[PDB]
């Protein structure tokens, strides 16, 4: 069933941007969704998303742009110990020149660059690039 609500959503926003779809809604919604999408907003990977408030769960509607090649999700949230952060961002991103492993540490949800500035580890969620 709905186990992981990212994988759910991120499939459907990778899986639109292939078709070139202009915008998409994501059915279940969550806090973690919002908080990881707002990360994608900063590096440009999407445009402004506007969350509907069906009284229950939430829907979102994501303005897409052309720019997202793929976003995916590492499904079990392994615990990343900062020394490993490299070994991951080697084998999970296309280059050292862009690509963003979104993860979730002590000091909020954020990309790997921002966990490195603050010097924290934590749990991998996914990656967009």
């Amino acid at each position: 069933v709905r186990m992981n609500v990212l994988a759910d959503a991120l499939k459907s926003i990778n899986n639109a941007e292939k078709r070139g779809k202009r915008q998409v809604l994501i059915r279940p919604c969550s806090k973690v969704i919002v908080r990881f999408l707002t990360v994608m907003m900063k590096h440009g990977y999407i445009g402004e998303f506007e969350i509907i408030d069906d009284h229950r769960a939430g829907k979102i509607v994501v303005n897409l742009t052309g720019r997202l090649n793929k976003c995916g999700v590492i499904s079990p949230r392994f615990d990343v110990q900062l020394k490993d952060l490299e070994k991951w961002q080697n084998n999970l991103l296309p280059s050292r020149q862009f690509g963003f492993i979104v993860l979730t540490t002590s000091a909020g949800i954020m990309d790997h660059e921002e966990a490195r500035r603050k010097h924290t580890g934590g749990k991998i969620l996914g990656f967009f690039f």
């Binding site: 779809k21 202009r22 915008q23 998409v24 809604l25 509907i52 229950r56 829907k59």
Partner: protein
């Protein structure tokens, strides 16, 4: 295709969508404030009835229930408009 303004969907194309599939989940049902010929009394019948709606008076019976909406009996009116 390539541009469907999902957030501002024109009123028609939610009514041709299954209740839960809509942008916001709303029902496709209603109450009706019902006259009936004998008594002037108005009962507050819910379209999709399930049970037989009897008159606040007594004798007459308003709504046989069927699959979807309720079958009003013979010659009796109703009033949607609200909310």
């Amino acid at each position: 295709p390539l541009a469907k303004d999902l957030l501002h969907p024109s009123p028609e194309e939610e009514k041709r969508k299954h209740k839960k599939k809509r942008l916001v989940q709303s029902p496709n049902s209603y109450f009706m404030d019902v006259k009936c010929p004998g008594c002037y009394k108005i009962t507050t019948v819910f379209s999709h009835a399930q049970t037989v709606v009897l008159c606040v008076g007594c004798s007459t019976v308003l709504c046989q229930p069927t699959g979807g909406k309720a079958r009003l009996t013979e010659g009796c009116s109703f009033r949607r408009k609200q909310h």
